[PDB]
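Let us walk through a complete example step by step. Step one is to write down the protein sequence. Step two is to encode the small molecule, 1-O-phosphono-alpha-D-mannopyranose, as a SMILES string so that its atoms and bonds are unambiguous. Step three, shown after the inputs, is the structure prediction itself.
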Amino acid sequence: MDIAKRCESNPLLSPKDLKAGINDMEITCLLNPGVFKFKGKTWLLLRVAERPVQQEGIISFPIYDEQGQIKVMSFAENDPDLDASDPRVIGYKGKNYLTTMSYLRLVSSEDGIHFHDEPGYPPIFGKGELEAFGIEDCRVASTKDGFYLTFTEVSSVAVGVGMMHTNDWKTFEHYGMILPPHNKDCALFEEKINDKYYTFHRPSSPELGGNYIWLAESPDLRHWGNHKCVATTRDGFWDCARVGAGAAPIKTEAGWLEIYHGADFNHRYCLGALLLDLNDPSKVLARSKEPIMEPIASYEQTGGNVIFTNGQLVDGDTITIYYGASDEVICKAELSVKEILNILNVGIL
Amino acid sequence: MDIAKRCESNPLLSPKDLKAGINDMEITCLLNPGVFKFKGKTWLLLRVAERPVQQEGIISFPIYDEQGQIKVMSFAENDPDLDASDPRVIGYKGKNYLTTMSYLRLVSSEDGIHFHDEPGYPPIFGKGELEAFGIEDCRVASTKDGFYLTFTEVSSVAVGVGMMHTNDWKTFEHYGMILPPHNKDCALFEEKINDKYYTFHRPSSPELGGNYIWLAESPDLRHWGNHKCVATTRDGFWDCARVGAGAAPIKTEAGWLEIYHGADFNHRYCLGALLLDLNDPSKVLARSKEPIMEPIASYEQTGNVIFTNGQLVDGDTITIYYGASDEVICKAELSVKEILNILN
Ligand SMILES: O=P(O)(O)O[C@H]1O[C@H](CO)[C@@H](O)[C@H](O)[C@@H]1O
Ligand SMILES: O=P(O)(O)O[C@H]1O[C@H](CO)[C@@H](O)[C@H](O)[C@@H]1O
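Step three: the predicted structure of the complex.
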């Protein structure tokens, strides 16, 4: 099944490798990095999750107050108004809170393996009401007009999608919430088709639907419409519970090649391939029957049974994905375009 | 709390008053009408729900066949793979079906009271994959460029929002699904602000959120962005469970006046008032503490629901049309100045 060539140095980055970005917090997780080239280097835009030192019998976590300043909230673990069954999202008196706060952090490399913070390139932290609980899982589209970031915006009122733009990775323009709750896994295409922009996204339905891959179009990147359902989950398959796009699709001669993630009802996450028509990206030409990558390395099963990619580089036939493993550490692997197309029974020349 | 002046002829229309739009089916519900003026008359754009005659031991419901024609599907009541416990949504082998299909139906009036079908003006049925389970709860914006319809699109993959445009109520242009699932209660503003279009909407969150009133902007009506949360539910209030906009807001000197609906955890629906800033409609200037209208007439409890997504305005008098008990169509008047006074 698995056709990924893992980097021998995996994991490349773990929580212990970096100093905490938020005063008095500690890094619990590094994951789901955006990937791009800039100034001769390979860059990761890390999702970094932080929280305070946990005292016994007490769950403690950061929030931004109304003034955009960091504070700490805490609950007794045995509080009868607390549901802490999920370790990511807790409930207290009918309201939801995250156990950590995520922000986006830049690291660079000259070899694609050893990464470090770069002086003059500080992190991107959540701003405003709709990002009070943090920002997550940022895709980076490298385009002729610069870099477009599409990420989860989290608050007490929404899990939604934001977009920002940069040329220099120091100043940013923010386009607001482009897609309302409940939505994430937003993969902007790096070029126009038929004079429009396109993105994959992933709305969640409480009923009459599920967690499927969708398409939307835009004339301007700020405003989105003409929504289309591209690919659902598949009953009795590895991807029966939820699907979502990763990074931007790769332009091949046979179509748009999309490395998506799918999960089963055991919360095991694997990677598959979708091939969409060049001119009509809502049209599926091919889909992996089995995964092309599964969480089978030791570091892909800790703490659990998760690989997740939302960033890659492509050089000829070689795709270099960067990925989160166990929602905790950062890893690299290579895949072959032609091998994927061959396995998919797609003709190539 | 209730300050509505109900029309003495309520209900204006009940299921029995109309012949079925789909041959041999029964009208179960008339509700939640769009409202507009055209060719000197008052029109309603009804939500009509139909299903076949129910036979003993058999649950039957409408489907689109492969040829896009309305037909019937049926299951034995004692089938062990059938869950027909809910009367709105049934389950069979892990797939969901609605028990009725909704479409949009035009009726007109010369007096605002007695409505009838108009020859030459047939109904609007769902078309395409994203409307396979019907269309619902259509808001009608009357604008200088004609009429814009914003309605629920329902299918097995999504409850989302569609938009159509018409000048003559015979020919329509369809702009597709403007808002993805899970969304409805889309109230398009009838004029631009700072050279953009605005709409209220109502995404539903499985967690980290709820069912709140949201705002979006557009340069072109087809494409939407810059989403903003306008008003949440209120813990301990009549509107603790869910809120949603009705029709387009009314332009007043004090701001945009929006007659919204809100529900509690007993599924009682009432109407309230929201006042938004003229230039920044995401900004709430005032909100009714109590409802301005509650389901207290007999026909509003046959269950404890009033719902409006259409109205006319003549001076200080708002004439709302509304669904009552999710079954019948009714009319009432409200005073702009009385609402604004309450809101101080
Ligand atoms: O909604 P999705 O596409 O299933 O992804 C979610 O689960 C992943 C696995 O824990 C996480 O890595 C992601 O951050 C996200 O919370
Ligand atoms: O999502 P909302 O705004 O709370 O409204 C829903 O419930 C109303 C009352 O049953 C219905 O009348 C509506 O059609 C809708 O199903």
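Step four is interpretation. Chain B touches chain A through 48 residues (CB under 8 Å).
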